[PDB]
Amino acid sequence: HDAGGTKIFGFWIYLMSDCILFSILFATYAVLVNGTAGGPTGKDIFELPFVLVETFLLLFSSITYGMAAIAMYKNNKSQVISWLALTWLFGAGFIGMEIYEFHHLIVNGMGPDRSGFLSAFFALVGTHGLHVTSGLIWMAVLMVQIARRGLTSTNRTRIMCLSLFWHFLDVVWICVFTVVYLMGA
Amino acid sequence: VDHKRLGIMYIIVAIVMLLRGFADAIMMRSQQALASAGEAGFLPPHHYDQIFTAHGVIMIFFVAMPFVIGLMNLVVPLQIGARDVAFPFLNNLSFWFTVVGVILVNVSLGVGEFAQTGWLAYPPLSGIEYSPGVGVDYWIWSLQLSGIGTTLTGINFFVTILKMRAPGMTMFKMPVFTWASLCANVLIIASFPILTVTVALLTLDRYLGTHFFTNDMGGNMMMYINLIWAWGHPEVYILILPVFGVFSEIAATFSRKRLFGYTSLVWATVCITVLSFIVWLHHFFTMGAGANVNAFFGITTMIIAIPTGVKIFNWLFTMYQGRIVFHSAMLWTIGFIVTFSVGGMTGVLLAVPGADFVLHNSLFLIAHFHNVIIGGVVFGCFAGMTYWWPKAFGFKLNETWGKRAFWFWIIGFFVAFMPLYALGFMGMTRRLSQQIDPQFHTMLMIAASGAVLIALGILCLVIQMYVSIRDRDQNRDLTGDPWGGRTLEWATSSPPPFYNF
Amino acid sequence: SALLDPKGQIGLEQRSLILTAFGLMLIVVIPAILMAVGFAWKYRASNKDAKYSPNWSHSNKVEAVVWTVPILIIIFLAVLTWKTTHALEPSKPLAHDEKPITIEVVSMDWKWFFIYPEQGIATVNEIAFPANTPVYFKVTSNSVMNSFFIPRLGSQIYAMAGMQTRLHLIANEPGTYDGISASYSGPGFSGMKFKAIATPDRAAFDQWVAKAKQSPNTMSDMAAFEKLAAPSEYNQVEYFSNVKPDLFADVINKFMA
Numbered sequence: 001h002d003a004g005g006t007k008i009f010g011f012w013i014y015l016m017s018d019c020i021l022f023s024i025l026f027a028t029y030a031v032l033v034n035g036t037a038g039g040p041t042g043k044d045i046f047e048l049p050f051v052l053v054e055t056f057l058l059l060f061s062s063i064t065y066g067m068a069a070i071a072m073y074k075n076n077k078s079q080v081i082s083w084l085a086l087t088w089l090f091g092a093g094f095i096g097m098e099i100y101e102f103h104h105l106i107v108n109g110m111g112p113d114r115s116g117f118l119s120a121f122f123a124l125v126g127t128h129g130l131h132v133t134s135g136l137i138w139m140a141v142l143m144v145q146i147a148r149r150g151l152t153s154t155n156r157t158r159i160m161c162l163s164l165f166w167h168f169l170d171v172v173w174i175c176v177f178t179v180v181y182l183m184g185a
Numbered sequence: 186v187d188h189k190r191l192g193i194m195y196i197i198v199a200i201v202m203l204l205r206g207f208a209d210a211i212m213m214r215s216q217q218a219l220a221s222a223g224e225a226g227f228l229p230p231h232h233y234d235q236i237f238t239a240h241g242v243i244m245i246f247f248v249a250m251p252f253v254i255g256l257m258n259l260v261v262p263l264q265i266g267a268r269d270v271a272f273p274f275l276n277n278l279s280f281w282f283t284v285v286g287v288i289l290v291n292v293s294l295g296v297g298e299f300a301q302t303g304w305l306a307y308p309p310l311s312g313i314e315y316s317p318g319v320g321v322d323y324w325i326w327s328l329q330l331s332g333i334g335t336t337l338t339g340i341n342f343f344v345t346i347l348k349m350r351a352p353g354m355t356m357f358k359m360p361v362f363t364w365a366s367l368c369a370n371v372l373i374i375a376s377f378p379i380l381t382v383t384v385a386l387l388t389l390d391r392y393l394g395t396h397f398f399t400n401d402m403g404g405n406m407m408m409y410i411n412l413i414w415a416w417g418h419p420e421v422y423i424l425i426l427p428v429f430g431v432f433s434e435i436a437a438t439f440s441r442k443r444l445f446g447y448t449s450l451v452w453a454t455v456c457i458t459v460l461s462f463i464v465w466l467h468h469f470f471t472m473g474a475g476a477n478v479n480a481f482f483g484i485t486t487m488i489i490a491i492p493t494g495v496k497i498f499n500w501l502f503t504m505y506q507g508r509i510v511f512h513s514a515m516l517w518t519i520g521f522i523v524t525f526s527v528g529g530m531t532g533v534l535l536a537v538p539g540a541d542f543v544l545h546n547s548l549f550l551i552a553h554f555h556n557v558i559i560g561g562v563v564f565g566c567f568a569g570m571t572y573w574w575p576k577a578f579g580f581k582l583n584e585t586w587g588k589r590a591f592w593f594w595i596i597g598f599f600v601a602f603m604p605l606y607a608l609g610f611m612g613m614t615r616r617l618s619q620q621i622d623p624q625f626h627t628m629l630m631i632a633a634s635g636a637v638l639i640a641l642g643i644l645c646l647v648i649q650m651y652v653s654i655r656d657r658d659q660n661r662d663l664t665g666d667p668w669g670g671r672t673l674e675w676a677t678s679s680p681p682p683f684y685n686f
Numbered sequence: 687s688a689l690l691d692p693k694g695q696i697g698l699e700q701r702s703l704i705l706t707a708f709g710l711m712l713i714v715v716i717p718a719i720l721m722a723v724g725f726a727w728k729y730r731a732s733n734k735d736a737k738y739s740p741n742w743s744h745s746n747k748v749e750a751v752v753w754t755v756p757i758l759i760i761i762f763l764a765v766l767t768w769k770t771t772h773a774l775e776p777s778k779p780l781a782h783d784e785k786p787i788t789i790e791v792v793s794m795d796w797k798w799f800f801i802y803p804e805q806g807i808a809t810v811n812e813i814a815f816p817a818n819t820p821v822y823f824k825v826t827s828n829s830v831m832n833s834f835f836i837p838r839l840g841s842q843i844y845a846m847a848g849m850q851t852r853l854h855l856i857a858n859e860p861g862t863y864d865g866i867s868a869s870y871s872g873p874g875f876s877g878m879k880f881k882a883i884a885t886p887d888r889a890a891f892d893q894w895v896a897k898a899k900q901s902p903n904t905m906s907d908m909a910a911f912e913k914l915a916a917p918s919e920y921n922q923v924e925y926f927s928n929v930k931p932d933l934f935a936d937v938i939n940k941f942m943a
């Protein structure tokens with residue numbers, strides 16, 4: 001009766017691994033930038049970084065309107081799954097545009113990549129495009145887990161944990177655009 | 186799968202491996218004694234570069250690294266008053282991963298195409314190694330696997346300490362070897378990741394043709410250098426902070442007196458942990474640093490002495506009132522308080538920008554650190570190894586040869602590295618394979634001579650221990666040492682009942 | 687057979703090499719006392735010298751004991767840092783009198799090529815220059831980075847590919863010298879040594895260029911340039927009687943675009 005929420009602070013510290021990664025990385029980009037846009041430069045129109053954002057933004061509250069109707073508020077079994085589902089959908093979507101764009105950024109470029117501003121950037125997201133792969137797969141896996149096992153009030157450790165991992169992710173994404181895209185350009 | 190036994194689990198790896206590293210070094214260090222090609226029989230640098238460089242590549246990440254990840258692994262628990270460690274299955278893999286990197290290292294060596302870019306492996310030298318270049322590749326891989334591992338330990342253990350000590354114990358009653366264990370441990374957290382990123386950046390360079398560091402398309406070297414060196418300095422802190430702990434207890438016990446300046450030392454450990462993420466440029470000075478950015482990174486590191494004095498002086502006062510014993514353990518403790526503070530100045534000296542301009546990457550450099558490492562860190566490992574050898578094996582240490590291996594170990598260090606300092610003033614270029622100036626050719630002989638002794642000693646101890654396990658005076662007491670050694674672990678049986686305690 | 691800083695034949699070296707000794711003599715105030723307290727202990731505080739092991743906790747002026755003094759060191763041996771931290775440093779610092787030559791380093795594979803902007807010749811593994819005069823150093827790299835360093839002159843600095851390194855120097859005595867490489871190790875990183883021929887006066891210096899002027903070889907182009915930079919360890923002290931008007935820039939450019 002104490003070891004219950006141990007993996008929590010024991011994961012909350014775990015973010016200090018994927019929290020600094022996203023900081024030194026930014027530092028690289030933040031460097032690989034002032035090199036002055038010399039000729040070849042790929043621009044981005046303010047539409048995808050609004051549909052990408054929105055999507056990934058609804059999740060910030062696809063768990064805010066959920067956590068409660070997940071256990072906190074008097075649990076209701078299923079009433080904690082169909083929502084995860086929706087949530088997984090937006091994850092698979094957010095990752096979609098994250099792929100449509102790239103393709104488009106290699107359909108014109110017949111292979112050979114150039115410059116770092118289509119390098120660092122070209123990777124900055126990648127990570128943010130992987131973190132939201134496993135952190136999007138572990139979610140759905142535990143989904144099928146919450147089925148047979150089925151968690152309940154107080155007893156929900158992981159889904160309130162993950163609701164901190166991901167809740168952090170979007171935070172990192174409430175910059176990406178609000179620094180790279182808009183500002184950069 | 187039990188923290189305690191995993192603890193040993195480490196040490197083993199280390200020992201079995203120093204039988205390799207040493208051998209490796211013990212051998213190449215010869216070439217600088219005689220002139221010409223020598224009995225070596227080596228064609229151009231190919232191998233020299235590899236070897237002498239692979240060395241330091243190892244000793245830092247695979248044989249001396251285990252120390253902290255090993256010790257805290259076998260003694261932090263039993264003394265705070267617990268039953269094992271927070272994340273079971275994980276504490277296991279924290280090692281098993283550091284293991285992978287092992288066999289993974291001799292994978293680049295099992296083909297003779299092992300890198301030679303500096304234990305760190307700088308740019309223009311790394312990526313340019315032809316398309317067939319799988320050499321550094323293995324190097325960039327072994328440290329990744331191994332990377333993640335030690336990354337957990339600092340997490341795992343961090344939790345154990347912040348949620349599983351002894352009931353009633355306030356964070357203030359925390360033992361020395363524990364306070365320090367925290368500090369250095371948190372470090373592996375807020376610092377070790379840095380490398381991972383960096384290591385990846387390269388990954389793409391040599392594997393995907395990206396230009397994270399190619400200035401011919403957009404990349405820059407002045408970036409890669411910052412990261413490795415930003416997180417590098419810390420590496421030198423997590424590998425000695427813990428020793429403070431081990432050192433404190435080995436001292437206090439036998440001298441029969443509590444560790445003076447408690448609070449004082451307390452924050453020291455704290456302080457020392459802060460002023461570390463902002464002083465890395467002292468590895469940059471030559472690579473063009475802003476005369477003003479010189480200070481922000483040169484001056485910072487210069488204050489870091491004050492924190493070092495605390496510890497030392499504080500242990501002294503722990504001696505001032507007498508009744509100290511000088512057995513195996515307390516003997517190393519000696520060396521520390523000596524050698525360590527020896528090379529210390531060297532760091533206080535190089536601290537100033539210009540003071541190093543002539544010595545940087547010169548033998549002096551090699552002499553500055555091996556000091557604080559060999560006689561400052563490698564002493565710890567051994568020093569502690571004694572104090573706790575029973576608490577984990579069921580038997581005490583042969584005080585005979587223990588006093589023997591010691592001397593050969595203190596003596597030789599100097600006959601093998603104090604000479605290097607000279608070579609530095611006359612300005613000797615590091616990792617060279619071919620030199621000529623008769624002068625250097627001389628000190629080198631002394632140096633390459635200081636080892637013949639150190640070498641043989643690594644044998645005496647290692648042979649003594651064997652003699653200590655098989656043959657033993659089976660101790661059946663609970664505490665072979667005086668009442669001075671007072672930490673919850675001791676009260677326990679040696680060894681502990683298999684299910685801990 | 688030496689145990690002290692390089693031969694005092696340079697102005698800078700003084701306020702750069704003296705630094706070390708000066709401070710080392712003002713640091714000892716600690717190590718000596720540290721190599722004092724640690725020693726004296728196993729002495730009188732021993733078993734046969736102290737019936738037992740009494741016990742106490744603090745006083746807080748025990749820290750003071752060794753408190754204000756360390757920081758006193760890290761102040762004296764601190765103020766110096768700041769001030770002293772200049773001279774050799776880059777940036778721009780102007781100081782001319784229409785005499786200070788301006789060499790340009792082109793450390794290629796295991797050799798040290800040079801470019802004389804207003805002379806017309808070229809070198810490999812040896813750069814001469816007058817005495818008591820400014821030596822303007824323009825440096826960079828064609829292959830991997832390296833270090834430009836003259837021991838007896840305490841003059842070191844990097845040489846990163848695609849960039850200009852700034853450093854100047856003053857020799858205050860004739861004689862030749864030698865220059866070593868950078869921390870990097872590999873086939874030949876231990877053979878890249880050059881001299882620093884410092885003749886009596888510039889009269890004999892005007893001739894150093896002369897002799898080269900005769901050299902039956904010139905560095906007129908980049909095609910020829912990559913030729914002298916081709917794989918070859920330990921290059922003999924070679925020369926060139928001609929150097930394309932802008933070879934320096936010729937390098938950076940290619941390795942910047």
Ligand code: HEO
Binds near residue numbers: 467489530536562759
């Ligand atoms: C873990 C080992 C270790 C330790 C403990 C230290 C400790 C220190 N180091 Fe050393 N270092 C270590 C390992 C290395 N250092 C390096 C490089 C390095 C460099 C750059 C040199 C170069 O790469 O060319 C500098 C300037 C220092 C400074 C210091 C300082 C000031 C300390 C301080 O911690 C010293 C603390 C001790 C003191 C201060 C003396 C004791 C006396 C006291 C405290 C009384 C107070 C004294 C005064 C007030 C004067 N280190 C490199 C080279 C990396 C490479 O290969 O490139 C390594 C491996």
Ligand code: HEM
Binds near residue numbers: 237558
């Ligand atoms: C007394 C036993 C040891 C001996 C005799 C020894 C000897 C050497 C020698 C001769 C070099 C090459 C210097 C040069 O030519 O530039 C070297 C380099 C190095 N040593 Fe040791 N060493 C010893 C212990 C250690 C230990 C315990 C460590 C700590 C981890 C260590 C870390 C290094 C490192 C990092 C380098 C540089 C590697 C590189 O070139 O990339 N050494 N050592």
Ligand SMILES: [Cu+2]
Binds near residue numbers: 421467468
């Ligand atoms: Cu450092």
